[PDB]
Design a protein around this ligand. Structure first.
Ligand SMILES: COC1=CC(=O)C=CC1=O
Ligand SMILES: COC1=CC(=O)C=CC1=O
Ligand SMILES: [Ca+2]
Ligand SMILES: [Ca+2]
Ligand SMILES: [Ca+2]
Lengths: 124, 124
């Protein structure tokens, strides 16, 4: 679920404020997305976006209000190491791994100040 | 989800082994249930059973494999105080509260050794 992802990011990047850092970054860090990502970072967000598309597109999973973000899963974070509980059901595990992969991904992308609050209708 | 309930019980009753204590107790502590509960304790289990029936019977909720037990929610336990995260979605919150109410309930029922592994086909 949304909040758990915010705190996955804080886990992988301790010195960080997710909502402020990774919302409206580039073309795909934020609601929806368009165009080609501008970045490794923005790429991590596009993949996450696509990861939520696949889960949405699994017959077995019927998310609340149709938004995988609504789906709480249960993880743990020991010193920059995210772990998705194995006892997550299949849909929760899939959502969990989208978030985790994205947090691992953000930890390793370069952050370019330039692309925070990008003019999306010009560059995306 | 099942495992979270097991650890809700350990939270409310610290000196306890849930799987061993509350599985096949009386008529309703364990898979399904029949007849009238024998106990306060067994009553707590019947109510839980019924609580999972109501959730199952909410149009908005479509559980995996159709079993609310499959649904992970996110709670916290500070010294015999269960707290269901408010950021649980509606179905997770409902499941959460069934488990919590049942753990609070078990903590306060008398435990009668007599009714562990009851002969259900005679007394239930
Ligand atoms: C909705 O997009 C995001 C929100 C956050 O809080 C953190 C990262 C995101 O990508
Ligand atoms: C399935 O019934 C139960 C299993 C547990 O582990 C603990 C309590 C129960 O009622
Ligand atoms: Ca996006
Ligand atoms: Ca039962
Ligand atoms: Ca869940």
């Amino acid at each position: 679920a949304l909040w758990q992802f915010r705190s996955m990011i804080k886990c992988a990047i301790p010195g960080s404020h997710p909502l402020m850092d990774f919302n409206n970054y580039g073309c795909y860090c934020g609601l929806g997305g368009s165009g080609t990502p501008v970045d490794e970072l923005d790429r991590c967000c596009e993949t996450h976006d696509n990861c939520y598309r696949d889960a949405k597109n699994l017959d077995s999973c019927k998310f609340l209000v149709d938004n995988p973000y609504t789906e709480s899963y249960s993880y743990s974070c020991s010193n920059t190491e995210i772990t998705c509980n194995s006892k997550n059901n299949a849909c929760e595990a899939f959502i969990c791994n989208c978030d985790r992969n994205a947090a691992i991904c953000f930890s390793k992308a370069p952050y370019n100040k330039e692309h925070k609050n990008l003019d999306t209708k010009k560059y995306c």
